[PDB]
Amino acid sequence: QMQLVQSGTEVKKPGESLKISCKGSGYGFITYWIGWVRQMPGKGLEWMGIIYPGDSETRYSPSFQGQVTISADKSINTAYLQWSSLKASDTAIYYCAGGSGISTPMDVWGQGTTVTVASTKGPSVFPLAPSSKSTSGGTAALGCLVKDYFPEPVTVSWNSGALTSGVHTFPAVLQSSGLYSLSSVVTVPSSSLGTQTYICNVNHKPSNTKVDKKVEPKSC
Amino acid sequence: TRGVYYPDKVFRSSVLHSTQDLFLPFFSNVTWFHAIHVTKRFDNPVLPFNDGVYFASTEKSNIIRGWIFGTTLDSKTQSLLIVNNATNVVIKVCEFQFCNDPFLGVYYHKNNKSWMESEFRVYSSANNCTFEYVSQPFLMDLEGKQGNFKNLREFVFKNIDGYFKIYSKHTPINLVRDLPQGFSALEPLVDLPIGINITRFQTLLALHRSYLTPGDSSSGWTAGAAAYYVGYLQPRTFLLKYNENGTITDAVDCALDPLSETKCTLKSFTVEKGIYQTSNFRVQPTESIVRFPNITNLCPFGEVFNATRFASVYAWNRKRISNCVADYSVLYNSASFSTFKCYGVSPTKLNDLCFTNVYADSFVIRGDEVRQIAPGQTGKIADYNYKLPDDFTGCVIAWNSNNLDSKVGGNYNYLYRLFRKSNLKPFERDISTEIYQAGSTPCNGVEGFNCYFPLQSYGFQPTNGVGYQPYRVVVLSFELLHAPATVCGPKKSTNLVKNKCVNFNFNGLTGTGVLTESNKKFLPFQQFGRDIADTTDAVRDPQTLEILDITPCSFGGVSVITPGTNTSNQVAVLYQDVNCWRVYSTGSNVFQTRAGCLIGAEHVNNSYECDIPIGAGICASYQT
Amino acid sequence: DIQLTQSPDSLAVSLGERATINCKSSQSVLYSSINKNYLAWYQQKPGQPPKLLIYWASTRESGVPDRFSGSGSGTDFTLTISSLQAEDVAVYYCQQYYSTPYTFGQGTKVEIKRTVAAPSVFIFPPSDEQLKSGTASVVCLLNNFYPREAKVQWKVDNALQSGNSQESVTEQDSKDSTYSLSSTLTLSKADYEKHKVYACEVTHQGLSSPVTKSFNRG
Ligand SMILES: *[C@@H]1O[C@H](CO)[C@@H](O[C@@H]2O[C@H](CO)[C@@H](O)[C@H](O)[C@H]2NC(C)=O)[C@H](O)[C@H]1NC(C)=O
């Protein structure tokens, strides 16, 4: 069983040209028909194309026929998927998978490479105050609310990773402006409210924005 | 009904699961051993360890202290010691020189009332120790008790694939003798990776000594009451009930009774009133054997791949290879291998399957036209020379040999057909040398104007381009219809047995059946012989070349007549092909009807309305 | 060219219960020569590439535990998990590989099931910072609620608000299968100067009476 190693993660602006490599390592690689599959975020797989390394016979799908080009290089055992001019709808994860013949299920799958096409806008983090009148013998919630950040993802770490129990992180939901919002909330009993300090750490790497914002209980 | 443990670990809930494992035979025959002073009878024999042991212990004073498991127990082989000394639990795997009569000793002092452990006389020496475990220290009671037995401790011991597996359960009891009734499933306790060959075992007990036990070491000892019971693990099938919390609360022994067999088949604990077809006398299969062709006599892949001359494409060479263990090591590019397509079947996983007569077709073609050898190609090669079926389940192999096929003058002995009347039906070889009539000129084989010659040579030169070079090709075609005892990928085999119920698997055909010597003589081209019902009833097997017949562990007709499980457990059995003996049990009340032999029912001279139809005018009922 | 269909989309069963998933094909995918159905079943775990599970719709790949079984014929195929465990929650895809192109299944999400729970509600108003920018945002937090059959209604001066809210539901908590729903309302400064009573009202099946959480403007 010969494993496939993918090239890596690329972030590109609209209008560029993009080449993705699938590298095949292992013995017996004389008959593996390489195929490509694209997974859009949180959706089902959609098969794109299949090429035989060497002979270079290439079969496409009707939807993608001519949008992209699949080529193979036999000497180094590689397969290339190329976009001439990638649009802004091509942000997705791509997997190269190798069957052993035509009409054979694909069993060896490469890790996969994500592609993001967009313009970075940094995150405005604002901290919600825990309600003043809460369950003294029980618990109350507090958290900081990241807004207007494009594109995904934003990493929210609580107290440099010290606190991990009851930390709810909610997936980003895109509102009208395009810039996704995201809220992370922790639940704390009303005993540790006075003494333990809260610092949410928001990391948005595309915009290179690392912020450490304290959560403050608001009183009169 | 004791000793139903947890076979697997997959958490189940309220799903009846039929399982084939090693369980206590219901109402089996266990051996009983005492430690009763009154006779002494300090029993500690060395016992067999056949396929696993059920060990039960009725105690009130912690007499049974452990076990030793091994083969010879004499420091030439490795043995396992599981002992509970007054303070720790000790599990050791070493080369022990065990004592002939191992035991433990508890001494009682009169002046101050106290029982303490004094003697540990189990082994002389232990040298090479591979596995060791000592538990955390505890204090045990050791006090002699006077009441009846108060504690039942049940263990199950198994030895599978280098693991010694222990299940156990403890139960409070209040009794004096025998193994008690009831049901309680044992839970997994430990799984030791010891890796030794256990065949025998011996129980380790403890002694009591006081001022009332006068003598030397070998005679001044009393016993203390205790009892233990030894049962073995036979293969059988069971139905287990898992309830909503995941506990085994009930079980059915599927080979105890015909009634239990109907329960097992219906997969329920309740049987309605009717007629259920169990089987003739049924013996659960105790073994399983597999036989594939000997690992020799490989397919002549050499005589197809490494040959002096390949034929021309107009008349290719076809060969049928069969009765071999094909290994598919050709796929590795041990020599030059330009192409390897394999439409329809994966060569990697092809090895595990058993195929029939994989044909090999060999020819020589020009460099460009190698592509045309595919399903659904349209060219001179794939129209008049060699045509592949639309659905193809094979493997196209092409390689280049410029050095063998390129004479500096030119190898013109390779030809192909150019002009033909119509296309070729799949795998049809039309070798003819007629004169093609390309026009309305009846030229009577003179090769004149408008009449050509179909065959035309190939120009091969070493100082020529890659496109016009000689590529040798071989096309493997796999087919599978019947009698697959021909090609079978390399797999090891076991021994052959006769006269038992054993799981058989011959050249890719499996089953459960008795094997006997057969007087049938098979023509050389057959391996499987079938009866009227089409079920395989004969086998040849390549290693021994000896005909073996196949008998289902049950032959005949059976039907069980039940009043209803709510009303009673008494049932009658009808054997449809017995004239009253191929019966499970004879009992009494054997009555012959045209429907068969009926066992378990009393025949009366009245004539009522039909309650339960038996057949041929005979009916049954449950009366006073 | 031969689209597939799966059913059901989302199925919830308890631990140790059976699980049946059905795949339906437009046309029979039976190869005449070998008489083998051409159809495979795949398992995908969140955040990893899929894994082969069943090929030829009857045979299991090496290492797959017995629990997974595949059956069917003609156009109808099913995958049965005799007893589900804590590791099988995932998405399952049925793929036909008879002739190119290779169509895929929609995908079935298998999740476990627990007894009904009641959600302790929370409510957070916008901070001082939110006000300055010009877009106040109030949020209401359901926590630790099973099952996802519920609905959050915002309350402003005894008048319902529609079309100005979003809802973010989290994935099943691994240790105990409880969700957590966050409903958020985005309103301009004008809609904040609107009134005095901001409330979140939650309706959930297990909870007998819809709950109310209100905070006075002050
Ligand atoms: C045809 O001849 C070649 C040359 O001997 C064979 O290649 C050898 O195959 C054996 C099989 O295990 C290897 O051990 C040798 O190392 C190979 N020689 C090499 C690589 O130089 C080839 O196998 C023959 N054809 C067939 C079908 O066996």
* Test the C interface: residue of A3, A33, A103 with most C CBs within 10 Å: A103
List Cα–Cα distances, A93 to A11, A45, A88, B619, C47, in angstroms: 12, 10, 14, 72, 11
**H helix or E strand, kind and range, residue A72:** strand A69-73
Specify whether the CB–CB gap between A186 and A142 falls below 8 A.
yes
**H helix or E strand, kind and range, residue B402:** helix B402-405
Specify whether the CB–CB gap between A40 and C104 falls below 8 A.
no
CB-side neighbour CA atoms (13 Å) of B8: 16
Other C-beta atoms closer than 10 Å to the C-beta of B537 total 18
Please tell me the distance from the alpha carbon of residue B200 to that of residue C97, in angstroms, as a whole number: 55
3-state helix vs strand vs coil in chain B, percent to 5: 5, 40, 55
Distance between Cα B343 and ligand 1 center (Å):
25
What 3-state class would DSSP assign to B403?
Answer: helix
Whose alpha carbon is nearest atom 9 of ligand 1? B334
Other C-beta atoms closer than 10 Å to the C-beta of A53 total 23
User: What one-character DSSP code corresponds to residue A28?
Assistant: T
Please tell me the distance from the alpha carbon of residue A75 to that of residue A121, in angstroms, as a whole number: 43
Q: Which residues fall within 8 angstroms of residue A94, CB to CB, at 6 or more apart?
A: A20, A36, A37, A38, A39, A81, A112, A113, A114, A115
Nearest to A143 by CA among A153, A129, A154, A163: A129
What are the φ and ψ backbone dihedral angles of A160, each rounded to 5 degrees?
A: 45, 40
| Interface touch B13/C15, C-beta < 8 Å | yes
What 3-state class would DSSP assign to B575?
Answer: strand
Specify whether the CB–CB gap between C197 and C156 falls below 8 A.
yes
* Chain B neighbors of C32, CB-CB under 8 A: 391
Specify whether the CB–CB gap between B239 and B263 falls below 8 A.
yes
Please tell me the distance from the alpha carbon of residue B338 to that of residue B473, in angstroms, as a whole number: 10
Please tell me the distance from the alpha carbon of residue B166 to that of residue B155, in angstroms, as a whole number: 7
Question: CA dihedral defined by B567, B572, B574, B580, rounded to 10 degrees?
Answer: -160
Other C-beta atoms closer than 10 Å to the C-beta of B460 total 21
Q: Which structure tokens are listed for B166?
A: 């222990």
Specify whether the CB–CB gap between C160 and C203 falls below 8 A.
no
Q: Which structure tokens are listed for B113?
A: 């009332």
List Cα–Cα distances, C151 to A17, B465, C125, C165, C184, in angstroms: 46, 75, 20, 12, 13
Task: State how far Cα C57 lies from the chain centre.
Answer: 27
Instruction: Report the length, in residues, of chain A.
Output: 220
The approach used to solve this structure was cryo-EM
B393 lies within 8 A of chain C by CB: yes
Nearest residue on chain B to A53, judged by CA atoms? B339
Whose alpha carbon is nearest atom 25 of ligand 1? B302
Taking the CA of residue B306 as reference, the ligand 1 atom at the shortest distance is: 1
B139, burial (CB in 10 Å: exposed 0-12, middle 13-18, buried 19+): exposed
Does ligand 1 have an atom closer than 6 angstroms to the CB of B588? no
In one-letter notation, the amino acid at residue B5 is Y
Q: How many helices (H) and strands (E) does chain A have?
A: 0, 18
Please tell me the distance from the alpha carbon of residue C43 to that of residue C89, in angstroms, as a whole number: 10
> How far apart are the CA of B15 and the nearest CA of chain C, in angstroms?
7
Q: Is the dihedral of CA C30, C31, C34, C40 positive or negative?
A: negative
Specify whether the CB–CB gap between A179 and A150 falls below 8 A.
yes
Please tell me the distance from the alpha carbon of residue C161 to that of residue C155, in angstroms, as a whole number: 7
Q: Are strands C181-188 and C135-143 parallel, antiparallel or unpaired?
A: antiparallel
> How far apart are the CA of C6 and the nearest CA of chain B, in angstroms?
25
Omega cis (within 30) before C8: yes
| Interface touch C106/A44, C-beta < 8 Å | yes
Does ligand 1 have an atom closer than 6 angstroms to the CB of B147? no
* Chain C neighbors of A127, CB-CB under 8 A: 127, 129
In one-letter notation, the amino acid at residue B460 is F
List Cα–Cα distances, B324 to B298, B354, B524, B560, in angstroms: 5, 11, 15, 49
Q: Find tokens 């089409």 and name the residue.
A: B534
**H helix or E strand, kind and range, residue B405:** helix B402-405
Q: Which structure tokens are listed for B308?
A: 């002096």
Specify whether the CB–CB gap between A79 and A54 falls below 8 A.
no
Nearest to A182 by CA among A119, A133, A102, A125: A125
Q: Which residues fall within 8 angstroms of residue B329, CB to CB, at 6 or more apart?
A: none
Please tell me the distance from the alpha carbon of residue B36 to that of residue B222, in angstroms, as a whole number: 9
Specify whether the CB–CB gap between A22 and A34 falls below 8 A.
yes
Q: Find tokens 């071989």 and name the residue.
A: B474
Q: Find tokens 């051409």 and name the residue.
A: C38
**What is the Cα Rg of chain B in Å?**
38
Nearest to A37 by CA among C202, B418, B157, C95: C95
Q: Which structure tokens are listed for B603?
A: 């025949």
What 3-state class would DSSP assign to B266?
Answer: helix
Task: State how far Cα B594 lies from the chain centre.
Answer: 41
DSSP bridge pairs for B68:
B81, B202
DSSP code string of B79-118:
EEEEEE-SS-EEEEEE-EEEEEEEEEEEEEETTTTEEEEE
Of B339, B346, B371, the CB nearest to A101: B346
C-side interface with B, Cβ within 8 Å?
Answer: 14-18, 31-34, 65, 67, 82-83, 85-86
Specify whether the CB–CB gap between B394 and B475 falls below 8 A.
yes
Does ligand 1 have an atom closer than 6 angstroms to the CB of B301? yes
Of B331, B339, B343, the CB nearest to A28: B331
User: What one-character DSSP code corresponds to residue A172?
Assistant: -
Specify whether the CB–CB gap between B256 and B209 falls below 8 A.
no
Other C-beta atoms closer than 10 Å to the C-beta of A198 total 20
* Chain B neighbors of C31, CB-CB under 8 A: 344, 391, 393
Nearest to B270 by CA among B561, B565, B560, B18: B565
A55 lies within 8 A of chain B by CB: yes
Other C-beta atoms closer than 10 Å to the C-beta of B181 total 8
Nearest to C2 by CA among C76, C99, C85, C79: C99
User: What one-character DSSP code corresponds to residue B324?
Assistant: B
**What is the Cα Rg of chain A in Å?**
24
Please tell me the distance from the alpha carbon of residue C38 to that of residue C73, in angstroms, as a whole number: 10
| Interface touch C31/B393, C-beta < 8 Å | yes
What 3-state class would DSSP assign to B610?
Answer: coil
Q: Which structure tokens are listed for A216?
A: 């403050």
Other C-beta atoms closer than 10 Å to the C-beta of A89 total 9
Q: Which residues fall within 8 angstroms of residue C69, CB to CB, at 6 or more apart?
A: C79, C80, C81, C82
Please tell me the distance from the alpha carbon of residue B608 to that of residue B621, in angstroms, as a whole number: 10
Distance between Cα B334 and ligand 1 center (Å):
6
Please tell me the distance from the alpha carbon of residue A162 to that of residue A168, in angstroms, as a whole number: 15
Phi-psi region of C37 (alpha: psi -120 to 50; beta: other; left: phi over 0): beta
Please tell me the distance from the alpha carbon of residue B449 to that of residue C78, in angstroms, as a whole number: 67
User: What one-character DSSP code corresponds to residue B600?
Assistant: S
* Chain B neighbors of A30, CB-CB under 8 A: 331-333, 337, 340
Please tell me the distance from the alpha carbon of residue B473 to that of residue B397, in angstroms, as a whole number: 6
DSSP code string of chain C:
---EEEE-SEEEE-TT--EEEEEEESS--EETTTTEE--EEEEE-TTS--EEEEETTTEEPTT--TTEEEEEETTEEEEEESS--TT--EEEEEE--SSSS------EEEEE------PEEEEE---HHHHHHTEEEEEEEEESBSSS-EEEEEEETTEE--SSEEEEEPPPPSSS--B-EEEEEEEEHHHHTT-SEEEEEEEESSSSS-EEEEEE--
What 3-state class would DSSP assign to B352?
Answer: coil
* Chain B neighbors of C15, CB-CB under 8 A: 11, 13
**H helix or E strand, kind and range, residue B404:** helix B402-405
Nearest to B344 by CA among B480, B491, B509: B480
Taking the CA of residue B334 as reference, the ligand 1 atom at the shortest distance is: 20
Q: Which structure tokens are listed for B213?
A: 């036990």
Alpha helices in B254-360 (DSSP H): 258-266, 302-305, 347-350
Q: Which structure tokens are listed for A155?
A: 């990493």
